[PDB]
Amino acid sequence: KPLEVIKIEDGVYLHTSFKNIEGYGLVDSNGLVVLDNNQAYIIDTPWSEEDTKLLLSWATDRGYQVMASISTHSHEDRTAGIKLLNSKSIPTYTSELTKKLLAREGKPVPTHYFKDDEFTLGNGLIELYYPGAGHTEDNIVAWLPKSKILFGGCLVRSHEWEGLGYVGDASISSWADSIKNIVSKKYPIQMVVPGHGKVGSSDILDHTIDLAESASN
Amino acid sequence: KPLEVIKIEDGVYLHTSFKNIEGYGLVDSNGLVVLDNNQAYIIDTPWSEEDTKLLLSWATDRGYQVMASISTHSHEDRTAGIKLLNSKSIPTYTSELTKKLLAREGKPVPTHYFKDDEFTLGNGLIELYYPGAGHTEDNIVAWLPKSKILFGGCLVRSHEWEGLGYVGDASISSWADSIKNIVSKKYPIQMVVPGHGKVGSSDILDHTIDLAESASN
Ligand SMILES: [Mg+2]
Ligand SMILES: [Zn+2]
Ligand SMILES: [Zn+2]
Predict the structure, then answer these.
(1) Does A24 contact B19 at a Cβ distance shorter than 8 Å?
(2) Whole domain around residue A198: which residue ranges?
(3) What are the binding positions for Zn(2+) 4 in this chain (chains A, B) (predicted)?
């Protein structure tokens, strides 16, 4: 089932990829391609490397220069596409914690990494933020000040789910505190993109907190 | 997370292995071990070679002789262990169809297969039956006369699922007739074991038909 790419705002594109199988259904995962003129920035590589190659095709066929990718944590729906992009000399970005954590697992690692809780890419275009542990110890989010879109990755859950889902890496205890750190940025969010499922509004934050305290208590 | 093996009837054990999905959570997969004095029969291998190692150890730590396995269709949650069992000269069986589908896909093959719609293992202990396509073109079921258990594998869905699961290799329109054919055998079904989810009663068959007619439209 091949990659899908669609525009969700000027210079912002949603890519959805489909990994499946072995007696479970089809799972979808989302990331973005964010444009500043001809220059593209990828947020979370497609699951597989064959779909990541297609995403790179989508970009360059349209004459886009792919400046960098950013992964939102060490798990593979966000990552191991990092290997391919490295092989092409395209800068791959994560948090330091994430880079170290990928190394500990002997998995391929980004060539670039940022050190504190905040970091900006594209000269203003993409603001990254580590709010604390949640779905994973290292999950970050990305804020796009132009389109007023927050990419929540698996730190958040679309309205279509009713369970945080996977928590083996998680800190249900601390999840609620992390989303609140997000709400504290007071981003003027007009849209949230989850790692899985459907794009929605700012209300996805509240719904996520709804499920984090439901599972602590 | 490790295989679980639990007694569900005299001489019948449910083995359940787990795989963990991206932001969705834990998915389980069931098979059975059927004992006959101290001879043991594996109906579906666990979902991975390591969980298959653990099942064989469970058996042999109890003084059981693992006589054979049978796989209910060609997919991984049913056949992952086939390579391992082959390397220990444990006879492995599938239907003729399942075998040729595995060989077509470059996957290791059972060392034995049956040609007809009906077959038996363990000399009547395990009755097999191919009732037509459903979840796959090749799915078979296992009837256990003594315990009165029907192992329906992925041809059936337990009550807690309100979908049909992965349908990219399914025959949605033949699915209902195929369940119908199982009913026609007039097995005094006491428990239905699904490939995923909880063990139930013969209700599971009606539920499954329901879901199947539904998707048909
Ligand atoms: Mg199993
Ligand atoms: Zn299957
Ligand atoms: Zn994750």
Answers:
(1) yes
(2) 1-217
(3) 77, 154, 196
